[PDB]
Amino acid sequence: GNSPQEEVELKKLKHLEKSVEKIADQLEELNKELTGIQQGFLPKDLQAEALCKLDRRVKATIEQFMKILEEIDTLILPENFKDSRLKRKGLVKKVQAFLAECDTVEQNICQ
Amino acid sequence: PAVGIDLGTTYSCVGVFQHGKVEIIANDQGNRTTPSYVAFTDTERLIGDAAKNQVAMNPTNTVFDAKRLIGRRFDDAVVQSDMKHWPFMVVNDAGRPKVQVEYKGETKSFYPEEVSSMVLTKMKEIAEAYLGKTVTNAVVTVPAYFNDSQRQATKDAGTIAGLNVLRIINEPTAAAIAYGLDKKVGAERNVLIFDLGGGTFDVSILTIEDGIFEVKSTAGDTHLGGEDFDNRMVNHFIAEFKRKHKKDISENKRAVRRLRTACERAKRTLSSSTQASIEIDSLYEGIDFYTSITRARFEELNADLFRGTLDPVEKALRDAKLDKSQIHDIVLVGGSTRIPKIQKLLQDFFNGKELNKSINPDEAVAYGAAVQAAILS
Ligand SMILES: CNc1nc2c(N)ncnc2n1[C@@H]1O[C@H](COCC(N)=O)[C@@H](O)[C@H]1O
Numbered sequence: 001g002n003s004p005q006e007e008v009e010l011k012k013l014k015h016l017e018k019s020v021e022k023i024a025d026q027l028e029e030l031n032k033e034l035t036g037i038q039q040g041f042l043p044k045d046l047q048a049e050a051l052c053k054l055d056r057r058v059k060a061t062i063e064q065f066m067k068i069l070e071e072i073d074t075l076i077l078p079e080n081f082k083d084s085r086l087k088r089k090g091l092v093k094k095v096q097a098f099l100a101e102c103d104t105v106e107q108n109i110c111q
Numbered sequence: 112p113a114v115g116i117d118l119g120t121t122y123s124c125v126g127v128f129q130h131g132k133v134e135i136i137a138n139d140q141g142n143r144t145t146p147s148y149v150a151f152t153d154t155e156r157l158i159g160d161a162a163k164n165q166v167a168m169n170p171t172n173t174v175f176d177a178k179r180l181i182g183r184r185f186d187d188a189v190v191q192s193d194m195k196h197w198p199f200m201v202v203n204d205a206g207r208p209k210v211q212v213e214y215k216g217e218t219k220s221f222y223p224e225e226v227s228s229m230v231l232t233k234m235k236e237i238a239e240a241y242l243g244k245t246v247t248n249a250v251v252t253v254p255a256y257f258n259d260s261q262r263q264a265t266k267d268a269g270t271i272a273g274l275n276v277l278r279i280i281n282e283p284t285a286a287a288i289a290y291g292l293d294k295k296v297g298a299e300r301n302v303l304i305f306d307l308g309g310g311t312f313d314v315s316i317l318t319i320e321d322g323i324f325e326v327k328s329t330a331g332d333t334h335l336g337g338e339d340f341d342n343r344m345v346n347h348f349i350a351e352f353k354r355k356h357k358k359d360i361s362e363n364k365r366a367v368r369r370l371r372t373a374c375e376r377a378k379r380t381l382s383s384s385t386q387a388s389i390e391i392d393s394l395y396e397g398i399d400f401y402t403s404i405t406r407a408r409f410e411e412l413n414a415d416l417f418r419g420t421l422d423p424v425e426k427a428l429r430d431a432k433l434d435k436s437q438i439h440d441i442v443l444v445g446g447s448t449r450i451p452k453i454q455k456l457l458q459d460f461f462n463g464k465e466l467n468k469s470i471n472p473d474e475a476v477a478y479g480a481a482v483q484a485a486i487l488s
Pocket residue numbers: 122144308309310336337338375378379380382445446447448449450473
């Protein structure tokens with residue numbers, strides 16, 4: 001039953017999908033630097049500092065992911081907008097798997 | 112060029128009277144109000160939206176609510192009370208609070224008005240970015256209940272920020288000015304100003320004769336506002352999730368946040384339509400939460416809080432020695448006054464009497480400040 005109006009919603013969802021990709025890239029960059037940092041030529045106080053810099057950066061990643069979530073949470077999708085509904089659902093769950101990732105890094109660095 | 116500035120507790124606002132009309136000025140983000148927030152960084156100082164946006168990454172170097180401290184002594188009942196709810200450091204420098212933080216890693220502290228001068232530097236900059244001109248002259252407003260030291264520490268914030276503060280005008284006076292209540296002609300007029308925002312509630316009764324203002328009394332509730340309505344919705348929806356799903360979301364901070372945000376936005380929708388729908392996919396344990404709320408349900412949740420905004424009103428009439436019959440004008444300010452039920456409780460307390468509300472209740476104070484500053488310049 002593909003309508004003009006669902007197209008608006010699908011385009012919103014795709015711009016949100018790309019935002020997500022930017023943040024996920026930020027998370028990938030975080031993880032890569034982290035693995036590098038636990039390569040201790042640095043003194044332990046300093047490695048610690050650097051790990052807290054990383055922790056503040058995961059916090060911002062969590063935060064940006066949460067702001068996306070709040071935005072998607074503004075959508076009202078009719079039952080028959082099956083296509084957007086499905087894209088909205090996959091995007092929410094993708095973010096939450098990314099959030100779980102950030103919790104893993106964050107729970108584990110700068111306690 | 113002369114601006115009016117509403118230096119609000121949570122939000123600030125700057126207008127300029129130009130071309131026969133006040134223009135409320137949007138910031139670099141397009142927001143017609145700006146968060147009264149400053150954050151302290153490894154590299155930079157952030158003010159306004161930038162600062163509010165990162166009150167998670169850096170909550171120890173992010174300061175708000177410095178209007179609750181400005182001009183007050185460290186042992187002021189108020190500086191003690193609010194202090195417990197502030198992740199930032201409040202230290203005692205010789206009986207008067209300085210805010211302590213880390214900034215480019217060197218440790219730094221500020222009295223409340225250096226911090227409020229920062230907010231006013233933003234508000235000045237916001238105006239200069241819009242006008243493409245230097246802005247030095249300003250009226251700054253304060254609450255009517257501000258003492259001498261609170262007014263003067265405010266004035267000084269403006270001066271440090273590089274403002275020629277033409278006048279410190281009371282918030283409910285500036286909102287009366289907004290509605291040109293002072294250009295009316297006849298006998299002495301009693302004005303009730305009803306100001307309910309996100310976090311505070313202030314009632315003020317002024318008399319105005321011959322364009323001259325006098326504050327008669329002041330009341331309110333320091334911690335009643337729109338946030339309290341958001342809570343009532345949140346508990347209502349948390350109980351609903353428990354009923355349908357046998358899950359308790361309330362220990363999941365990110366669910367609770369998703370719900371709260373959707374609650375506050377649903378509340379806004381309910382000020383101009385009689386029902387609000389919410390869909391949150393995957394709210395808790397992967398469970399979608401789709402729901403709606405009527406306006407009457409919203410009101411019912413809030414029935415005691417709304418009615419109760421009337422107690423400060425009666426307290427205010429009493430202290431001014433007026434009967435509700437002797438009030439000529441009622442002025443609404445603060446974004447929460449948008450709620451049709453509050454308008455109706457109040458407009459039926461004053462036996463069918465109407466209300467000055469046509470001006471955006473978040474912008475009315477800056478509006479009157481701007482009209483004032485143009486007269487004074
Ligand atoms: C524009 N606000 C705003 N618009 C409202 C509206 N249309 N209906 C009910 N409350 C409204 N608020 C409330 O004002 C308080 C202060 O808002 C300041 C802010 N910028 O959030 C908040 O409690 C907010 O829920």
